[PDB]
Enzyme design. Structure first.
Site, PDB file in Angstrom:
ATOM      1  N   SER A  23     -12.950 -55.229   2.464  1.00 14.97           N
ATOM      2  CA  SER A  23     -13.168 -53.814   2.623  1.00 14.97           C
ATOM      3  C   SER A  23     -11.827 -53.092   2.789  1.00 14.97           C
ATOM      4  O   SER A  23     -11.042 -53.402   3.684  1.00 14.97           O
ATOM      5  CB  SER A  23     -14.066 -53.595   3.829  1.00 14.97           C
ATOM      6  OG  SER A  23     -14.550 -52.259   3.870  1.00 14.97           O
ATOM      7  N   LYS A  60     -14.040 -53.588  -1.811  1.00 13.48           N
ATOM      8  CA  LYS A  60     -14.922 -52.572  -1.319  1.00 13.48           C
ATOM      9  C   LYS A  60     -14.080 -51.405  -0.802  1.00 13.48           C
ATOM     10  O   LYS A  60     -13.181 -51.605   0.009  1.00 13.48           O
ATOM     11  CB  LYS A  60     -15.835 -53.111  -0.263  1.00 13.48           C
ATOM     12  CG  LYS A  60     -16.434 -52.027   0.618  1.00 13.48           C
ATOM     13  CD  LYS A  60     -17.228 -52.636   1.768  1.00 13.48           C
ATOM     14  CE  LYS A  60     -17.545 -51.620   2.867  1.00 13.48           C
ATOM     15  NZ  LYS A  60     -18.551 -52.067   3.853  1.00 13.48           N
ATOM     16  N   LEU A  61     -14.373 -50.205  -1.332  1.00  8.55           N
ATOM     17  CA  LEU A  61     -13.683 -48.967  -0.996  1.00  8.55           C
ATOM     18  C   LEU A  61     -14.459 -48.055  -0.069  1.00  8.55           C
ATOM     19  O   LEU A  61     -15.614 -47.756  -0.319  1.00  8.55           O
ATOM     20  CB  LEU A  61     -13.319 -48.151  -2.237  1.00  8.55           C
ATOM     21  CG  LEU A  61     -12.667 -48.998  -3.302  1.00  8.55           C
ATOM     22  CD1 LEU A  61     -12.407 -48.164  -4.550  1.00  8.55           C
ATOM     23  CD2 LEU A  61     -11.359 -49.508  -2.725  1.00  8.55           C
ATOM     24  N   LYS A  62     -13.807 -47.632   1.005  1.00  5.09           N
ATOM     25  CA  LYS A  62     -14.359 -46.684   1.944  1.00  5.09           C
ATOM     26  C   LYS A  62     -14.218 -45.351   1.211  1.00  5.09           C
ATOM     27  O   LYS A  62     -13.193 -45.114   0.583  1.00  5.09           O
ATOM     28  CB  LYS A  62     -13.515 -46.601   3.214  1.00  5.09           C
ATOM     29  CG  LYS A  62     -13.706 -47.777   4.140  1.00  5.09           C
ATOM     30  CD  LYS A  62     -15.061 -48.409   3.959  1.00  5.09           C
ATOM     31  CE  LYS A  62     -16.003 -48.113   5.104  1.00  5.09           C
ATOM     32  NZ  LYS A  62     -16.449 -49.346   5.773  1.00  5.09           N
ATOM     33  N   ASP A  77     -18.244 -47.316   0.167  1.00  2.00           N
ATOM     34  CA  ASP A  77     -18.989 -47.141   1.401  1.00  2.00           C
ATOM     35  C   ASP A  77     -18.633 -45.828   2.038  1.00  2.00           C
ATOM     36  O   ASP A  77     -17.471 -45.636   2.410  1.00  2.00           O
ATOM     37  CB  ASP A  77     -18.728 -48.327   2.349  1.00  2.00           C
ATOM     38  CG  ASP A  77     -19.520 -48.297   3.639  1.00  2.00           C
ATOM     39  OD1 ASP A  77     -20.338 -47.429   3.905  1.00  2.00           O
ATOM     40  OD2 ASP A  77     -19.259 -49.327   4.429  1.00  2.00           O
ATOM     41  N   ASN A 122     -20.265 -44.476   4.814  1.00  2.00           N
ATOM     42  CA  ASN A 122     -20.459 -44.410   6.239  1.00  2.00           C
ATOM     43  C   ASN A 122     -21.148 -43.107   6.591  1.00  2.00           C
ATOM     44  O   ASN A 122     -20.791 -42.422   7.557  1.00  2.00           O
ATOM     45  CB  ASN A 122     -19.179 -44.704   7.102  1.00  2.00           C
ATOM     46  CG  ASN A 122     -18.909 -46.188   7.287  1.00  2.00           C
ATOM     47  OD1 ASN A 122     -18.011 -46.766   6.683  1.00  2.00           O
ATOM     48  ND2 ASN A 122     -19.716 -46.857   8.110  1.00  2.00           N
ATOM     49  N   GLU A 132     -22.703 -47.780  -0.601  1.00  2.00           N
ATOM     50  CA  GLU A 132     -23.196 -48.062   0.719  1.00  2.00           C
ATOM     51  C   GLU A 132     -23.339 -46.798   1.548  1.00  2.00           C
ATOM     52  O   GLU A 132     -22.475 -45.894   1.537  1.00  2.00           O
ATOM     53  CB  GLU A 132     -22.209 -49.065   1.360  1.00  2.00           C
ATOM     54  CG  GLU A 132     -22.823 -50.054   2.367  1.00  2.00           C
ATOM     55  CD  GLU A 132     -21.785 -50.982   2.965  1.00  2.00           C
ATOM     56  OE1 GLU A 132     -20.839 -51.437   2.348  1.00  2.00           O
ATOM     57  OE2 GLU A 132     -22.009 -51.219   4.234  1.00  2.00           O
ATOM     58  N   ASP A 175     -26.806 -49.755   5.193  1.00  2.00           N
ATOM     59  CA  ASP A 175     -26.095 -50.431   6.244  1.00  2.00           C
ATOM     60  C   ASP A 175     -26.649 -49.916   7.544  1.00  2.00           C
ATOM     61  O   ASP A 175     -27.582 -50.488   8.112  1.00  2.00           O
ATOM     62  CB  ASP A 175     -24.584 -50.102   6.098  1.00  2.00           C
ATOM     63  CG  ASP A 175     -23.704 -50.651   7.188  1.00  2.00           C
ATOM     64  OD1 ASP A 175     -24.180 -51.031   8.219  1.00  2.00           O
ATOM     65  OD2 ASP A 175     -22.406 -50.667   6.948  1.00  2.00           O
ATOM     66  N   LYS A 210     -25.740 -56.830   8.961  1.00  2.00           N
ATOM     67  CA  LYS A 210     -24.858 -56.797  10.126  1.00  2.00           C
ATOM     68  C   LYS A 210     -25.668 -57.226  11.368  1.00  2.00           C
ATOM     69  O   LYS A 210     -26.508 -56.482  11.942  1.00  2.00           O
ATOM     70  CB  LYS A 210     -24.229 -55.428  10.366  1.00  2.00           C
ATOM     71  CG  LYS A 210     -23.050 -55.109   9.475  1.00  2.00           C
ATOM     72  CD  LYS A 210     -22.441 -53.776   9.865  1.00  2.00           C
ATOM     73  CE  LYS A 210     -21.409 -53.312   8.855  1.00  2.00           C
ATOM     74  NZ  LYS A 210     -21.069 -51.907   9.074  1.00  2.00           N
ATOM     75  N   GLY A 230     -19.456 -56.619   7.793  1.00  2.00           N
ATOM     76  CA  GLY A 230     -18.516 -57.001   8.843  1.00  2.00           C
ATOM     77  C   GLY A 230     -18.217 -55.892   9.851  1.00  2.00           C
ATOM     78  O   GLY A 230     -18.240 -54.691   9.545  1.00  2.00           O
ATOM     79  N   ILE A 283     -15.151 -56.044  11.801  1.00  2.00           N
ATOM     80  CA  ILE A 283     -13.792 -56.261  12.283  1.00  2.00           C
ATOM     81  C   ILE A 283     -13.811 -57.164  13.508  1.00  2.00           C
ATOM     82  O   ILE A 283     -13.290 -56.831  14.555  1.00  2.00           O
ATOM     83  CB  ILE A 283     -13.202 -54.914  12.714  1.00  2.00           C
ATOM     84  CG1 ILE A 283     -13.356 -53.877  11.606  1.00  2.00           C
ATOM     85  CG2 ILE A 283     -11.739 -55.089  13.094  1.00  2.00           C
ATOM     86  CD1 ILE A 283     -12.758 -52.514  11.967  1.00  2.00           C
TER      87      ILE A 283
END
Ligand SMILES: CSCC[C@@H](NC(=O)CCC(=O)O)C(=O)O
Ligand SMILES: CSCC[C@@H](NC(=O)CCC(=O)O)C(=O)O
Ligand SMILES: CSCC[C@@H](NC(=O)CCC(=O)O)C(=O)O
Ligand SMILES: CSCC[C@@H](NC(=O)CCC(=O)O)C(=O)O
Ligand SMILES: [Mg+2]
Ligand SMILES: [Mg+2]
Ligand SMILES: [Mg+2]
Ligand SMILES: [Mg+2]
Lengths: 368, 367, 368, 367
Positions: D135, D161-163, D189, D191, D214, D239, D263, D291, D293
């Site tokens: 990520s 994977k790109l935020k 993602d 968020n 995501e 997620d 998760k 994940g 972290i």
């Protein structure tokens, strides 16, 4: 096979007692028989059309014509002829199911007779006899009706189909439930008599516990029926609307029918008939054999049909004598409310000419 | 009729060329044949099961045992027997459709031969010949593939069917399209090798104009196919999942299929095959005859069936020689991308004993 | 660890009383048992097939062969084995869930023993005892049925399940409801004996307040079940149809089912059975544990299984003596209508050699 | 198993490089660890909460609090403890899944060790190693981003994977795709940074062949996802929204998700996580391990989990160094784009006391 020719006859058998429907009273039946002539032998064909276009747009005279001028010739102009091939052959002609049915029927009978196979065998019967019910007309009175019914019950009939129409619904039904009981197989038939707006009226029967209500609305009104199904507790049964296997599929998929009434002529032949059975079966839709007040000729084929596995309901396969004093074939006799499936090749039945000619009204040979 | 007994034979037939599917490779063909014995005459039946339970849960040894122990015996016990009755007669035993289908075939062949009637007559044929397609296995190489395809193409094969697997989809396809053209009749068969999760790779085939994708997902995953169907352009075809006319109806109704492969053995008989045909027809679903690398025995009856009116797509009715150097019956020869529907009573074919006896490993009488 | 081999035994146990269902009558139980041998110890698996293929396609002889010739070999051929890896390892072979479930059972028990863990621990038990119902077969007479039911009820069984069939449905239900009252937990099981066309008949049980009607239609008929459910008031419960957690999900989504009967061998093993439990739970579909007239072996694994959180309905987890006078393991005895979940490693039980040897008819060693 | 007590530790770990998401920037990781103690041995639990309630409503201090006053005590009070029973025992308390999940973990680790069983065995691992992805956070520069990406791809990573954020979506992607190629496995993602009203915007990524997008919308907005799925070609991945197996089933049913990120603490435990996996699997929904972290503890459990059968997409199960120079346990080292599934009992890993002590900030014992 090669088609040699078709002899067309007009018959006129007088009914024991006038049978009144939502479409009109009947005192005498005007049929239309077919004699198919092959190299091998011959087959019989019976057309379910009537005098006039009141159950459907097809009627005796219209049939003749189409047959004569369109149908018969088409086949005659064919090299190989198989009841199967009859269908494709006649395909360019739109409609006239009852007519092609009768035709197909004649051919079929010949073919099966040539392989020495019974109708049943061809159709895949598994049963030897079939449970029979009877279709009771519109009486002018209760007791009248209450009487007849009881009458029929007596002879051994397993189920009762009551003819209904606006003004002849609930009452009749109420009266029969009342006299005879609740453990009686009872159903009604409106022969398209009602409308969606009459729902509430037909809702009125909910209480009675009928197996089904046959064609409450028009032939074309499938959705109306599905809607209707929604508003009443009585299982919808379609007749008129069922003109084919595809049609049956469609009506089922639309939730417009729970039980289907099979009329070989209506659907264009015993073969299609079989398919409709199959289709129905694959969709878990019980089927039953419908009657067009036929001779021992239609009656025999029906009986065979009706012995197919998915025919889980007694059909309108009543004894010859229910309508006819003198059948043009060995009559059919109730036996413990059943009718015996014909064991011999083809229909496994044939007409007795004195009987036949006495009723015949005309004739015509159509040939090559 | 009256069932006198049944002779079970085991037959082994070497393949002309190893046949690779997503379930494996196959160089030889073990079959099971059935000889129905009536006081009147004989009837032959072929079982579609194979060595192991790879295409389905049914297998040679399995079929043999059930037939022997359950199915044959229950028929013999019956007073009067008709192919039609077979079903109802064996209904107490769950599953075992390939086996049941073979037997019914045997019975039927007798019965018809007796009424001096062809399989095709009984089934309701409308044609005299049928256009044949071919099933092309998985190759090691693309060139390898291409030669092969071309090979058939020249033979006169009307349609091409490619076995695909994950790792053998798009390319092989890309290849045949490019090399062979846009007018070739092309379709693929995943023999259940994919998952709903592989949709995107499958969508990767959208561009090639295939007629269909045959059984991308597992046998039991009907709603999955329906979902899949919504994710790709390529029309869905089911094989494995279509075990009956009711299966067909269900699948259709659920939007899981657009075209149906009819495998008589798979559905439990030629009679049931017919019903599937009719059901599909009534719903506007085209069918096509599937193949189980059968002898001229199974081949004969399938050509018959493939002549039915709704069989609007070339089926897997290749010619005898596509698999067999020597068939146990008179071979089936491609005449201008077609095959001729048999004219004799029953199947219209019979094993050439000399030939049979050459390929028979075992035999047993059940009477 | 790494499969050393498996021993296949044929066992035959007489039933204290003959058991009748819609598929037949049974006086003796024929089973297939497996002793899996691993460097870490042995494990026991029980196969739920029976003599012939009547409840399903699988049967003793068939299972045996497949195990012997395909499944076992395939596990032997692995470098590493885990109960969990059993599935993937055997996936190439279509169907044969019962056989596979038996093998997975054997592996899993050996494995759990090695880890000194119990089946219940593994599965996720949250309860130390389970409510037991009883499965009552078809009787020759009602009175007969009334007593039997009477007796179990007396033994402290928490719910009664009645085996039904066309001709043995409403009456028997009526009789028991009537004789024993409305407070008893009552349900019926058709073992696929009906058709969609039988809805009206079934709809007749409506009034009895049944907990459910188990598998009225054929195994493959999921859609029909959803249809049927629209037609009746008794809740639909599926058995035969639930062959996997995916099967379960599909049926749930289709509205074909409301209560699921979990049968480990039927779905391919305890591991799969858990997934089913889990899938149902997530859809709010209550489950209960099915029975296959197993010995203490399967009985024990079943008791464990049934202590899982979603098993909110009494299962077919009766005391050993419901079927067997002498079980091959420590017997299961009803206490206040419950059976205690086993605490040892693995099944928490094992066969008593002399006992087992006595019912053993055949035995074979399958090694490399 | 009787719970003796638990030790709650506050842990602070420095990230090798600040981590930016739609909700903020992360330089340093503040965890929360539990040491369950039983007569026989110990087990470790790792909480995924973070300092503040930015990913979700749960945060380090609220966790500690509930754990202390509500959860822990609840388990102490029971006679028999089992991981499975933790649920039922803590069920009266609403929510606090990450916190309950943490407890469950330590208990389970202790329980599994006691039987000498790995988390992997318990969970049902079918694999020994798992394919890892990575990520990548929001960059300040496109170029600074391509660099980082190329770095990760170089390390051997299997998926990128790109935020993303309004203002950092298409370009980033366009950029990566242009530079790195179309063959890279790419995904994004949000968020929960977008709204239904941003559809057109997100539809802008259709061309890119992303595997998924995501959590574009808020956690509570299932229906909108379903809707959004309708307007964009990019597959929806949930997620935040997947707080449970039932949640997954609902979302699936409503068509709000095609791929599920799993998760463990978000769903309240590795046990629940397994169900989620199972549920998805049953619906033909692929899952992949997400994940948080984590230290080597959760990392370890996640790796075991990620080796389940339905995890058919690389997870955010990166090597240890991606975030920590000094992991409190034996470090996870990428090998062939894979991480090895632990073989020991329980986690199959433990904190290196020394190490653990350095990074501990607080510590309380609950008995
Ligand atoms: C007078 S013709 C009306 C056809 C009617 N037929 C009957 O009621 C059955 C008469 C018979 O037994 O043939 C029907 O709706 O099916
Ligand atoms: C590999 S065995 C048969 C499986 C496959 N069959 C064929 O491809 C047809 C082969 C044939 O022509 O007999 C199918 O799925 O239909
Ligand atoms: C061999 S028939 C047994 C199948 C049957 N199982 C039982 O009836 C329960 C028997 C038991 O208590 O083990 C079912 O259909 O549910
Ligand atoms: C650290 S909270 C942000 C979590 C982000 N997680 C990751 O990107 C995975 C990082 C890792 O643990 O490898 C996500 O929402 O999916
Ligand atoms: Mg009518
Ligand atoms: Mg195929
Ligand atoms: Mg049952
Ligand atoms: Mg995320």
């Amino acid at each position: 096979m090669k088609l040699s020719g078709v002899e067309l006859r007009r018959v006129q058998m007088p009914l024991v007692a006038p049978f009144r429907t939502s479409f009109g009273t009947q005192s005498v039946r005007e049929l239309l028989l077919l004699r198919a002539v092959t190299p091998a032998g011959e087959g019989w064909g019976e057309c379910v059309t009537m005098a006039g276009p009141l159950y459907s747009s097809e009627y005796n005279d219209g049939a003749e014509h189409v047959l004569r001028h369109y149908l018969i010739p088409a086949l005659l102009a064919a090299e190989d002829i198989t009841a199967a091939k009859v269908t494709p052959l006649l395909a360019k002609f739109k409609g006239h199911r009852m007519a092609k049915g009768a035709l197909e029927m004649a051919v079929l009978d010949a073919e099966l007779r040539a392989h020495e196979r019974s109708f049943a065998a061809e159709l895949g019967s598994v049963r030897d006899s079939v449970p029979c019910g009877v279709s009771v007309g519109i009486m002018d009175t209760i007791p009248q009706l209450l009487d007849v019914v009881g009458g029929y019950l007596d002879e051994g009939y397993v189920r009762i189909k009551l003819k209904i129409e606006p003004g002849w619904d609930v009452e009749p039904v109420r009266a029969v439930r009342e006299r005879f009981g609740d453990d009686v197989l009872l159903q009604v038939d409106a022969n398209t008599a009602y409308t969606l707006g009459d729902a509430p009226q037909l809702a009125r029967l909910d209480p009675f516990g009928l197996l089904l209500i046959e064609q409450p609305l028009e032939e074309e009104d499938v959705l109306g029926h599905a809607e209707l199904a929604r508003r009443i507790q009585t299982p919808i049964c379609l007749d008129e609307s069922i003109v084919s296997a595809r049609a049956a599929a469609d009506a089922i998929k639309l939730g417009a029918v729970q039980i289907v009434n099979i009329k070989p002529g209506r659907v264009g032949g015993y073969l299609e008939a079989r398919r409709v059975h199959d289709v129905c079966a694959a969709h878990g839709i019980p089927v039953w054999c419908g009657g067009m007040i036929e001779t021992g000729l239609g009656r025999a084929a029906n009986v065979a049909l009706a012995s197919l596995p998915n025919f889980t309901l007694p059909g309108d396969t009543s004894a010859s004598d229910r309508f006819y004093k003198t059948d043009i074939t060995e009559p059919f006799v109730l036996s413990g409310g059943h009718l015996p499936v014909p064991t011999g090749p083809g229909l496994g039945v044939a007409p007795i000419p004195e009987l036949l000619d006495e009723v015949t009204t005309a004739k015509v040979w159509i040939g090559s």
